[PDB]
Amino acid sequence: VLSPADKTNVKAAWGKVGAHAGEYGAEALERMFLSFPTTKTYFPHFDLSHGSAQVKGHGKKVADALTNAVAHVDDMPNALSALSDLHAHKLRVDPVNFKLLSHCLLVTLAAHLPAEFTPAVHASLDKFLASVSTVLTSKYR
Amino acid sequence: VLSPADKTNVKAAWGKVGAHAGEYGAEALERMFLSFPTTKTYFPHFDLSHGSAQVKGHGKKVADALTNAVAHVDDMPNALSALSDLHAHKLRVDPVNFKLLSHCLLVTLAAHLPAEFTPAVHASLDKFLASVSTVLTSKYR
Amino acid sequence: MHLTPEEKSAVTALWGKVNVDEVGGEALGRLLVVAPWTQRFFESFGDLSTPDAVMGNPKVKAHGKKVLGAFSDGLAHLDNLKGTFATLSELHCDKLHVDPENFRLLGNVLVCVLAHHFGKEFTPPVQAAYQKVVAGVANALAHKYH
Amino acid sequence: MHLTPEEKSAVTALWGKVNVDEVGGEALGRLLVVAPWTQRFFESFGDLSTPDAVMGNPKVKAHGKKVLGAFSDGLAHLDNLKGTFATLSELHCDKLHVDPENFRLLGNVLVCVLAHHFGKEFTPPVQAAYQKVVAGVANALAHKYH
Ligand code: HEM
Ligand code: HEM
Ligand code: HEM
Ligand code: HEM
């Protein structure tokens, strides 16, 4: 579970993301594609070339969802229900891939927020991404 | 989330284990130690040889805790509080390992409860061990 | 593989007793039931709405036999699983878009099916050698992903 | 170790700018903070009760520098990691009893640390080369477990 501290941390670090969320979302994806090529199997229909608008488009949607979980940090299961449904029933992404994206999102944030990416914040963001992943995977079986 | 069918299937299966749970506890550990030798890192103080009383006893202990879990299938978090504490603050076993013991336990039930280890029962027990693992690692951070 | 002659012998000898037809259908069907999300690749097979419906689906059973077949033949090239599954590795990547994690889910199901089937015969030392083979197969099959 | 020459040059160029003393302390400290369970190996290190207590503990800093020291040497034998890390693998197994999953956690933390430090210079493709490398090192460290 996320502690008050964690919650503060996440709102704070994400606060700083502001308007770059979209771009950071696109970048996390590209990093993921390059470091874990197996994740590509889920996007056979995408142009995964560098600067692909499909990826930009997708990075933004991922970023809006993360942004929505932060706004509803106290009711994530309900704020993300729909996306939980989609992932369980339609996309059926294997669970191990959430940790990969989580990881690439952390690298991205670290690469952009040197001042905020403190040990304490890193830990909070990691627990958060893990909780988001847990919600998205909750209805799998 | 364990469905009613699931809770039923589990209680049935475990119902047939009966006086043998301890032996199954012991057998699962042995299968874990051989198949995933990295798991042995957590028991440097044990005699891990075949038929060790340290392993047999530990086997019983584990077995018993599962029993208690089946019995309080509706309130696991609560029935296993102490155990979640112990694992998170003292043992600190890495989470990957829970999946390995869970698997050696399926294999063991399968090998011993042929008629009962149907595809639906298999699915249930799996979710169950999954749930149990979640509970035991919920207070890690 | 990093199999011991002793380990090689154990694999080899239990296999000898396997009905690939039956074991292939059961391993694949169990997969579809335990880890429901692997069904994403078999929509064209029909209704997999229930254990019964999966376990009963002939398309499933027949795919299961094709899979264990290939696996079976891999057991004859235990010293170069890489070269035996190269083309199958490309295919899975390039044509089917199957996430290699699936290869590991199946392997574990395979092991539960063998135990199920051989009871006593499937001893800790025998599972241990099988675990090494299933990991080895999965790695070989995943080897050509890019 | 599928490090393309271009991947190896990239690993090597960036490693050129690292202060192993510094990075070592941050990586280690950060691990004890993000995955507190890993603290199990260091109860003789004293106070690890808070992030500041961990990050600043002289013992964590000194140990981190040791670890990265060994890692750095590793980077000069990218060709023979297993060989390079053999006595260390034995030690972690037989004397220290360190679950190898620990090696992968540290690799990921390390990658975030490099991202933290190099900002924009830690490009998608540089990260992918380092991913292969942390993985090679963890595997080499786990090779002698039994
Ligand atoms: C916390 C992590 C994740 C979040 C927040 C997230 C969120 C989303 C959202 C908002 C969408 C678009 C739904 C729509 O069309 O409105 C989406 C689609 C999708 N996601 Fe997830 N996702 C996550 C993890 C993953 C992972 C790990 C993968 C696979 C590696 C994945 C694969 C997909 C695919 C294939 C689609 C559909 C894309 C398309 O066809 O346009 N997702 N996700
Ligand atoms: C299926 C989930 C598990 C259950 C229900 C379980 C249950 C238990 C129980 C009942 C005890 C004994 C408590 C006592 O001594 O009073 C115990 C101790 C212990 N468990 Fe867990 N355990 C599980 C998973 C694991 C795993 C996967 C590992 C590591 C591979 C592990 C490592 C240990 C160790 C090292 C001890 C202490 C042994 C000793 O010194 O006696 N446990 N566990
Ligand atoms: C033990 C590991 C596996 C082996 C040896 C294997 C082998 C095969 C073989 C020999 C084929 C025949 C296709 C052809 O030659 O055109 C095939 C097809 C296929 N496999 Fe795999 N497979 C494995 C695991 C999996 C898993 C775990 C999945 C998904 C859960 C999967 C999904 C598929 C699909 C969707 C096809 C195409 C079937 C069709 O054409 O309708 N495979 N596989
Ligand atoms: C890149 C991976 C790692 C490398 C290269 C590495 C290297 C080293 C070296 C060079 C030593 C000192 C050897 C000696 O005392 O003779 C050491 C000791 C040690 N390592 Fe590792 N290490 C690694 C990962 C880890 C991790 C992740 C952990 C724990 C989670 C760990 C736990 C320990 C402990 C507890 C000691 C002994 C400390 C003491 O003196 O009390 N190591 N390691």
UniProtKB/Swiss-Prot annotation, chains A, B:
Phosphoserine modification, residue list: 3, 35, 49, 102, 124, 131, 138
Annotated phenotype, changing residue 115 to D: In J-Tongariki
Effect of residue 74 to G: In Chapel Hill
Post-translational modification: The initiator Met is not cleaved in variant Thionville and is acetylated.
Consequence the record notes for mutating residue 87 to N: In Auckland; unstable
A GO molecular-function annotation: heme binding
UniProtKB keywords: Acetylation, Disease variant, Glycation, Glycoprotein, Heme, Hereditary hemolytic anemia, Iron, Metal-binding, Oxygen transport, Phosphoprotein, Transport
Consequence of substituting residue 22 to D: In J-Medellin
Effect of residue 130 to P: In Sun Prairie; unstable
Phenotype for residue 11 to E: In Anantharaj
Impact after mutating residue 109 to R: In Suan-Dok; unstable; causes alpha-thalassemia
Free-text tissue specificity from the UniProt record: Red blood cells.
Sequence ranges assigned to domain Globin in this UniProt record: 1-141
Effect of residue 138 to P: In Attleboro; O(2) affinity up
Outcome of substituting residue 59 to D: In Adana; unstable; causes alpha-thalassemia
Residues the record marks as carrying a glycan: 7, 16, 40, 61
Modified residues (Phosphothreonine): 8, 108, 134, 137
Modified residues (N6-acetyllysine): 16
Result, substituting residue 125 to R: In Plasencia; family with moderate microcytosis and hypochromia
Effect of residue 80 to R: In Ann Arbor; unstable
Mutation effect (residue 120 to E): In J-Meerut/J-Birmingham
Disease involvement: Heinz body anemias: Form of non-spherocytic hemolytic anemia of Dacie type 1. After splenectomy, which has little benefit, basophilic inclusions called Heinz bodies are demonstrable in the erythrocytes. Before splenectomy, diffuse or punctate basophilia may be evident. Most of these cases are probably instances of hemoglobinopathy. The hemoglobin demonstrates heat lability. Heinz bodies are observed also with the Ivemark syndrome (asplenia with cardiovascular anomalies) and with glutathione peroxidase deficiency. Alpha-thalassemia: A form of thalassemia. Thalassemias are common monogenic diseases occurring mostly in Mediterranean and Southeast Asian populations. The hallmark of alpha-thalassemia is an imbalance in globin-chain production in the adult HbA molecule. The level of alpha chain production can range from none to very nearly normal levels. Deletion of both copies of each of the two alpha-globin genes causes alpha(0)-thalassemia, also known as homozygous alpha thalassemia.
Other comment: Gives blood its red color.
Name of the featured protein: Hemoglobin subunit alpha
Swiss-Prot record, chains C, D:
Consequence the record notes for mutating residue 109 to M: In San Diego; O(2) affinity up
Effect of residue 131 to K: In Shelby/Leslie/Deaconess; unstable
Residues with attached carbohydrate: 1, 8, 17, 66, 120, 144
Effect of residue 24 to R: In Riverdale-Bronx; O(2) affinity up; unstable
Biological process annotations from GO: blood vessel diameter maintenance; carbon dioxide transport; cellular oxidant detoxification; hydrogen peroxide catabolic process; inflammatory response; nitric oxide transport; oxygen transport; platelet aggregation
Phenotype for residue 15 to R: In Belfast; O(2) affinity up; unstable
Effect of residue 23 to F: In Palmerston North; O(2) affinity up; unstable
UniProt binding sites for (2R)-2,3-bisphosphoglycerate: 1-2, 82, 143
One Gene Ontology cellular component: haptoglobin-hemoglobin complex
Effect recorded for residue 128 to D: In J-Guantanamo; unstable
Outcome recorded upon mutating residue 123 to I: In Villejuif; asymptomatic variant
Recorded consequence of changing residue 27 to D: In Volga/Drenthe; unstable
Misc: One molecule of 2,3-bisphosphoglycerate can bind to two beta chains per hemoglobin tetramer.
Protein name: Hemoglobin subunit beta
Upper lineage: Eukaryota, Metazoa, Chordata, Craniata, Vertebrata
Gene label: HBB
